[PDB]
Amino acid sequence: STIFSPEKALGLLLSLKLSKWQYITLRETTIREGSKEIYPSYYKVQKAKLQCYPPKAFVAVTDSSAKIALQALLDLTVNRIFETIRSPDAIQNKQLILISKWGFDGASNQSRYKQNIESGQGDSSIFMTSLVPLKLTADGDTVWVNPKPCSPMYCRPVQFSFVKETKDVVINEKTAMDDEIEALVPSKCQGHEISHKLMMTMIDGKICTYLSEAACYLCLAKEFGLSTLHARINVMECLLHIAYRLDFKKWSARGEGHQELLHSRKKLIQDRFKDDLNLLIDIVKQGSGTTNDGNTARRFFEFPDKTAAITGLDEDLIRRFSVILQAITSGEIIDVPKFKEYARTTAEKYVELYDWYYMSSTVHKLLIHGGDIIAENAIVPIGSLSEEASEARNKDFRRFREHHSRKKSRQASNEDILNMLIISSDPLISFTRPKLDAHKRQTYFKETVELLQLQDQ
Amino acid sequence: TIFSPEKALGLLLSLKLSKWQYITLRETTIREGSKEIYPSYYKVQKAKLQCYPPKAFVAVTDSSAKIALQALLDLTVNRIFETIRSPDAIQNKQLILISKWGFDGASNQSESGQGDSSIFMTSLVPLKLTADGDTVWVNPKPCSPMYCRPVQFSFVKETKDVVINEKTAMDDEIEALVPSKCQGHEISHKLMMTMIDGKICTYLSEACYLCLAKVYEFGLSTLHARINVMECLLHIAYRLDFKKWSARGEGHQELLHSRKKLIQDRFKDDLNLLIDIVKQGSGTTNDGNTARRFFEFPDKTAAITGLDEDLIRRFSVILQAITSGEIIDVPKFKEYARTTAEKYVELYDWYYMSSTVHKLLIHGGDIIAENAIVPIGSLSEEASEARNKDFRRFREHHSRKKSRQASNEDILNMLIISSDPLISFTRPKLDAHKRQTYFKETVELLQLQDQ
Ligand code: NA
Ligand SMILES: [Zn+2]
Ligand SMILES: [Zn+2]
Known part of the structure; x- marks a missing residue:
């Protein structure tokens, strides 16, 4: 009798982040233009919400x-x-x-x-x-x-x-x-x-x-619980660390006068993020050194075209890492063979650009073993x-x-x-529920949906 | 399409919808077997361009x-x-x-x-x-x-x-x-x-011709109406301990100031409201946002200020009708103001009503009727x-x-x-915001009872 089920409406509610009174007004305004098979009453939706809750006594x-x-x-x-x-x-x-x-x-x-x-x-x-x-x-x-x-x-x-x-x-x-x-x-x-x-x-x-x-087994052709939060942050930090050392292009800043200009570069980039993006990119609140939330890493990858101009990094690499983290965090099904080729090539682009900075354990586990981890549904x-x-x-x-x-x-x-x-x-x-939010629709890149094989346009 | 691009754009404003909420709403509505509902956002954005004047200014x-x-x-x-x-x-x-x-x-x-x-x-x-x-x-x-x-x-x-x-x-x-x-x-x-x-x-x-209601001192600003009525109610609340208009008197100032800070403290622990807070020049920098929240919950404001709940809701219903910009049932409003006025003197005949409260309750119906509200x-x-x-x-x-x-x-x-x-x-007769906030008495004064 209604196109949207009360439960299906509740899905549309979450997928759009609509308020109770936005949905009521959406209904009323859509009726007043001559069509009522679309949305149920919010009374029916509120009941569908109640059916998800466990008993109040627990x-x-x-x-x-x-x-x-x-x-x-x-x-x-x-x-x-x-x-x-x-x-x-x-x-x-x-x-x-x-x-x-x-x-x-x-x-x-x-x-x-x-x-x-x-x-x-x-x-x-x-x-x-x-x-x-x-x-x-x-x-x-x-x-x-x-x-x-x-x-x-x-x-x-x-x-x-x-x-x-x-x-x-x-x-x-x-x-x-x-x-x-x-x-x-x-x-x-x-x-x-x-x-x-x-x-x-x-x-x-x-x-x-x-x-x-x-321990790899020496990494054969012929591993642990990968946190989406941990992957998104430790890759941002890996990219930032490379950006600070672009003046001398060496992994260890221990050499003569390298530390002098690493801190100089790091302050230039930290300031760029604050006035160009309103981001506190590497600012520490004395909690062992990197008070970067997942929110900070999310915005670091939200605009690969801009992060590259700020940090001095290669846009191709940045966009590649962002597309990967998006697929991981979506929770949707990832085309494992199509993902491995994208990961295998992203790694190739890494050593192409920055072979001097050794890949962090998280970046290694992501690019090199990420295809398999996806395949064994081992992402947290x-x-x-x-x-x-x-x-x-x-x-x-x-x-x-x-x-x-x-x-x-x-x-x-x-x-x-x-x-x-x-x-x-x-x-x-x-x-x-829609395979991708109104949020996921706006933010995900062209390469991201291609990795998810989503017909949810 | 059921929604015209301009009619959709209305739905966009009335709902406070983002570009990507509207796109996903459209797609998700197709995917359940119905297209004729919403137009493309390009067509909606084109309608927006049609309201703008040229690069002329x-x-x-x-x-x-x-x-x-x-x-x-x-x-x-x-x-x-x-x-x-x-x-x-x-x-x-x-x-x-x-x-x-x-x-x-x-x-x-x-x-x-x-x-x-x-x-x-x-x-x-x-x-x-x-x-x-x-x-x-x-x-x-x-x-x-x-x-x-x-x-x-x-x-x-x-x-x-x-x-x-x-x-x-x-x-x-x-x-x-x-x-x-x-x-x-x-x-x-x-x-x-x-x-x-x-x-x-x-x-x-x-x-006043000795008061005669059946411009009108220039009209009535919706912004000023909400503030100058809130302030009038607060001044009554601060003086409730001794029930006198004059803040002078024997130690009245001592307990008037005590009440004013008690109520100011209630509005912060209960509501996060800065009721009479000054940042420049011994003043009373109360925002229009502040007056909106003062009347948003008359049952709660009354416990805080000690004022009569009926009166507060009555003043809130009126200020909502005024600020809605919609058509008000003038005869039904005059009766509502003329009874709210009676309730004022019923409770606080000792505090003389401010000129804005007088202008509203006694001459407000006529000001509405001659569309003299700014x-x-x-x-x-x-x-x-x-x-x-x-x-x-x-x-x-x-x-x-x-x-x-x-x-x-x-x-x-x-x-x-x-x-x-x-x-x-x-455009929808009343916002998604107005749906949630407007009271039954308010909607009836706009005679929007069944929408
Ligand atoms: Na509004
Ligand atoms: Zn390995
Ligand atoms: Zn008068």
């Missing part, structure tokens, strides 16, 4: 943290997965196997630059634990399978607190998860009974050394997704503050972001 | 922006003709377009941005198109910003000088007005400077607030020296698009 929103009980979240997901299977009349109901993925990561944030003058409340540092469902197995066969195993569209939020990622809080979160994992592991839906097998694979290198108290979006939430609460806090107190508006923000994270990671809602 | 500096009204009137006349049902007006030997003009200034507070951020805007409104004395076209919203054509806005504090400076600078371009041309008809222009308050009139020159000012404020947002977006991809003009360039255009006669003819 959701803990403080002025600090936010937590869902892992039992409640898995059961919620199972139900919404069944509503996307073509004919959920499966034969094995004695046992279904839902294979799921989990992990955690942390991101930082800065609201312009405001020291001794705070623009609101919030630690500007978020720590999020997430879960992703992978395969639905009955007697050894695939019944339903995740179409985007590394997209944030299936990155369910479990518990995010606005705390810095300590070695302790990592171990604290592992045992806090392992216990609620090791304790309860059943589920029920639509007559079938579903057990859960969880794998902690959304983990980077530093977390692994924590949990244990503690908790990082970038955790940051995008932080940017979105500080936005919500500045909106709620105008009619609520600080301690109350700070929780109304944690309440709303948990919801926004649930709708966006909902299997039935994500089942009909 | 695209004058956007790092400071000001100005259009010659000859180019603007000819522009307006042409866009007015595109809205008449049957332009078979036989009498074309002389057409009389009667238009309205004036100017007003607004201030602003928030220094990280660029700009003096105090704006002074001169605007023009077309009223009637006369053929041999007969109505050919008539303004459907004579006080709405939807027909408030911008002539020149400079970022200057409204000085005594710049008023007279603007008066003769406008007066000269008047006598030099050649009759406009469109569709074989010849249109002469008669302008009246009535969008003017009492302040401007005493400059140019170097009352939106210059609030429009200048919404423009000023909208440049600071473009500056914050353009700066993040452009230098300051260019972003300071790219903002002035874009704001003049959006003031033109919003004041374009053909676009406003098919």
Whole structure:
């Protein structure tokens, strides 16, 4: 009776970032011109939103943290997965196997630059634990399978607190998860009974050394959890470091008078980013040396034509690295053979231009082993997704503050972001969301969509 | 296509849609099996170009922006003709377009941005198109910003000088007005400077009959109406402890100041509002943005100030009707003002009502009825607030020296698009913003109850 389902409307809502009253006015104004099979009522959309939420008795929103009980979240997901299977009349109901993925990561944030003058409340540092469902197995066969195993569209939020990622809080979160994992592991839906097998694979290198108290093969033709956030930042930094040394073109600035003009070049480029782009590109807040958020790296690659004029780097190289990071962070399906050729050539262009600066471990793992990592669905979006939430609460806090107190508006923000994270990671809602945002449509390059083989023009 | 490019462009403004929100909205609407809905953004952008006057006086500096009204009137006349049902007006030997003009200034507070951020805007409104004395076209919203054509806005504090400076600078371009041309008809222009308050009139020159309601002390500025009523309510709130008009008295000043800071503190911990904060010269630099938030939540403001909630919402509903620019049910408004007035004396007969509150409640119906409400000012404020947002977006991809003009360039255009006669003819009766904020009593006064 309506072109857009209430759930499909909710998709269009997220894909466009439309407000409640923009959608109501969009509806009314589109009716008054003679067509009502298009959009449902917002009453129907609000109900579709409510259907994504888990029960209110399992959701803990403080002025600090936010937590869902892992039992409640898995059961919620199972139900919404069944509503996307073509004919959920499966034969094995004695046992279904839902294979799921989990992990955690942390991101930082800065609201312009405001020291001794705070623009609101919030630690500007978020720590999020997430879960992703992978395969639905009955007697050894695939019944339903995740179409985007590394997209944030299936990155369910479990518990995010606005705390810095300590070695302790990592171990604290592992045992806090392992216990609620090791304790309860059943589920029920639509007559079938579903057990859960969880794998902690959304983990980077530093977390692994924590949990244990503690190499290429020489790189054959004839590897770890790659964070989208970590890839985007450590490549910007690698490109910046090359830019500072363009005067002498040597990896080590240890030589006679090289350090003298590296700092000279670095200050020229730092100033160029501030007045040409309003970017604090390498400005340090004494937190071991590089307080560059994912926001800073995102804007460093947003305009390859301009970053090259600022840094003195080659535009071809910069655009190549940006297109790659876009494909990674989209969460969409990447044409692995088409990607490997693009990565293999980007590497060739690197040594063509800057063979003197050795490739960072992150750049090596990206360009040289990135094709395989994509192919084995081993890319971790908790990082970038955790940051995008932080940017979105500080936005919500500045909106709620105008009619609520600080301690109350700070929780109304944690309440709303948990919801926004649930709708966006909902299997039935994500089942009909556009392959690329209005944001992704505007920003992604010609080469990027070509790598994603997207017919979502 | 269901939406015309101009009608889509209206939907664009009414929703505050970005270029890429509209493109994705279109694509996503096709991908679900329906094309006939929205036109291309190139066709929408072409419609935007059609509102602009030529390179004749695209004058956007790092400071000001100005259009010659000859180019603007000819522009307006042409866009007015595109809205008449049957332009078979036989009498074309002389057409009389009667238009309205004036100017007003607004201030602003928030220094990280660029700009003096105090704006002074001169605007023009077309009223009637006369053929041999007969109505050919008539303004459907004579006080709405939807027909408030911008002539020149400079970022200057409204000085005594710049008023007279603007008066003769406008007066000269008047006598030099050649009759406009469109569709074989010849249109002469008669302008009246009535969008003017009492302040401007005493400059140019170097009352109640014992009250009788069934210009009217010059009219009513929407910007000044919201501020001078908020301030009147606050002054009542500060003196609630002793219930006397005079702030003098035995230690009254001591507890009046105590109440004023109590309420000022409530408006910060509850609302993040600077209610009477001064940055220059022992003053009361309350923005039009500040008055909008003072009335946005009458149930909450009343707990803060200790005032009667009914009264606050009543004053808010009225100021919303005034500022909407839409047509107000004059008989239904007069009854609403005349009852709000009764409620005022019911609660606070001890505080004499300010002249602005008197003019509104007692003479406001008639001022509405004679379309004597001036939106210059609030429009200048919404423009000023909208440049600071473009500056914050353009700066993040452009230098300051260019972003300071790219903002002035874009704001003049959006003031033109919003004041374009053909676009406003098919614009939604009330914004997406007005949907969320306007109260039931407000919509009923505009009689938009079912839209
Ligand atoms: Na508005
Ligand atoms: Zn290797
Ligand atoms: Zn009177």
